[PDB]
Amino acid sequence: MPDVQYPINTYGWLKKAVALWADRDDDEFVNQIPNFINFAEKEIYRNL
Amino acid sequence: MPDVQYPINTYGWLKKAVALWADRDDDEFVNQIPNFINFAEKEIYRNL
Amino acid sequence: ALYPIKSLGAVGVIADQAPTDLAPNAFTNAINARFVEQRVFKTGGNAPLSYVDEDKDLTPLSFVSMPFDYYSAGNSFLVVGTNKKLYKLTDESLTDISRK
Amino acid sequence: ETNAVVITDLNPLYPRDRDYIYEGAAQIRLIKQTLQNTFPNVTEPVDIDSD
Amino acid sequence: ETNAVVITDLNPLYPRDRDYIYEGAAQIRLIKQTLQNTFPNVTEPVDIDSD
Amino acid sequence: ETNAVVITDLNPLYPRDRDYIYEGAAQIRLIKQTLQNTFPNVTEPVDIDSD
Amino acid sequence: AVWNYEFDTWSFRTIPYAQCIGLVDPPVLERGPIWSDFQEITWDDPSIKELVWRKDATNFRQRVTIVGSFLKGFYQVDVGALDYFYDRLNDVVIEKPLEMRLERTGIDFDNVTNEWNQKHINRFRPQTTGSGTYIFEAGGSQFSNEYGHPHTSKTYTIGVDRHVSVRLNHPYLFYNVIDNDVNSNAAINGLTIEFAVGGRR
């Protein structure tokens, strides 16, 4: 449902592009989007 | 649906040829064409 | 994967029924759709009609497709009613034929 | 009617959007007759070779 | 009149009888088949050369 | 029914059956102008010599 | 509401404010006429326009079902696609393109996957017939009881398009098919929905 610009640059758009690239779009999922993001950035910076 | 030239000089045509090949253009998909591209060129230049 | 939905005309509306337990090829609502044989398509539409221009000022409550009359030839007509009169019409002209 | 006229050389817009309907079939007969008059023989005219 | 494939061997006079008013469209389509069949090679007929 | 065709390109498989055919007269004009444009010189075209 | 007794199948339709209905013979201008009748008519449509050289037939005697209407007149009730709506705000008649809708809520795919499983949709691969221009819609719900919310809609134009790209993942799909267009006589033999599987929470 959401829509996004081309040149993803902001957490703000990213939080939506994720919801997009995955079909399912629901509050059981979005509201924890950010948690997932936290997990990922942490997993990265942990050793990058 | 769309069409192109023999040589694909550029973006203006490529972003359509992609829709062509890869089977489909349905708007939920096209509008991210640019993003896919920004991904690919990067995946390239990172090591080319 | 895939979920084939074939013989789309097999059975039409199935309401009153568990929408998640219908057969694949069955509709929870339809309007102006026609179902036949194996297939689905737009029904024929409404569109107007007139014999003689005198008729278009007319609200016919009921009618008959009579084919024959002794004064007429072997040609068909109409017996058509209204709130106040019984008419006849035959692609040529109009007639009040009410019981005087 | 249309007398003293032969060959499809009449000016266009003859139907003029106002003819009846009884002139349309007469136009077809005139076209068929004139076309037959122009080339009264056809066997297999694939020998054009526009080049 | 479906049957005409040799072309130019049609029947313009009579079998119309000014009847049917449904066959005028069919005749036009049939005429298009006859015209296309005779000359199915047209790109730029600028070689008029009437003389 | 298209319009601007002068290359003997008349589509016969795109009419219609219940809606307006108020172009049969216009089809005749379209057919005539195609014939005139292709061969704008017709007085006695017996010059086929089919052999 | 219409029942086809050859296959025992129900649908519904609009009719033009019928007081009464019947079979009948039609007017002459429609009754298989003769170029030799229009001696007073002009190609220039004296407000008469609705004449297709050949109108498809339902009957060999070429007869017609007619409605006696509240709208001051008569109507034919099964003929080339239009609809005659009415407007009390203006006290006027309106003519609009005839709209088909087909609708199925809550396709669960339970004959291939479990109910609860989220189902990525990609494509509808139909097998159509005729000429026309459909509008497909698709959407879904995370729950079994809702008529889902639209995710997308697209035109399908026959001879040109072979499929329709729709992006979803909800476990219960719905689709609508709409045909609004005037010059269409298309039909559907069937579908074929392309999909995958995600998971569940």
Task: Produce a short descriptive summary.
Chain A is mainly α and 48 residues long.
Q: How would you characterize this protein structure?
A:
This is part of a larger assembly, with 2 copies of chain A (48 residues), 2 copies of chain C and 3 copies of chain D (51 residues). Chain A is 58% helix and 0% strand. Chain A has 3 helices and no strands. The longest helix of chain A is centred in the last third of the chain and has 13 residues. Chain A is flat. Chain C is an all-beta fold and 100 residues long. Chain C has a 4-stranded antiparallel beta sheet with strand order 6-7-8-9, with no helix packed on it. A two-stranded antiparallel sheet of chain C has the order 3-4. In chain C, strand 8 and strand 9 form a beta hairpin. Chain C is elongated, with a radius of gyration of 23 Å. Chain D has 1 helix and no strands. Chains in contact: A-B, A-G, B-G, C-G, D-E, D-F, D-G, E-F, E-G, F-G. Chains B and G meet through helix 2 of B and strand 13 of G. Strand 1 of chain C pairs antiparallel with strand 16 of chain G. The PDB classes it as virus. Keywords: bacteriophage, asymmetric, virus. Bacteriophage SU10 virion (C1).
Structural class of the secondary structure composition of chain D?
Answer: mainly alpha
Count of DSSP-assigned helices of chain D: 1
Strand order of the biggest β-sheet of chain C: 6-7-8-9
| Percent in helix of chain D | 25-40%
Number of strands of chain D: 0
What class, by secondary structure content of chain C?
mainly beta
Helix run count of chain C? 0
Strand and helix order of chain C: EEEEEEEEE
| Sheet with the most strands, sense and barrel status of chain C | 4 strands, antiparallel
The rounded Rg of chain C comes to 23 Å
Main β-sheet description of chain D: none
Bulk shape of chain D = elongated
Protein name (chains D, E, F): Putative structural protein
Organism (chains D, E, F): Escherichia phage vB_EcoP_SU10
Protein name (chain G): Surface protein
PDB class: virus
Write the topology of this structure.
This is part of a larger assembly, with 2 copies of chain A (48 residues), 2 copies of chain C and 3 copies of chain D (51 residues).
Chain A: H1 11-21, H2 27-30, H3 33-45
Chain C: E1 2-3, E2 29-31, E3 33-36, E4 39-42, E5 45-49, E6 63-64, E7 78-81, E8 86-89, E9 94-96
Antiparallel strand pairs in C: 3-4, 6-7, 7-8, 8-9
Chain D: H1 22-38
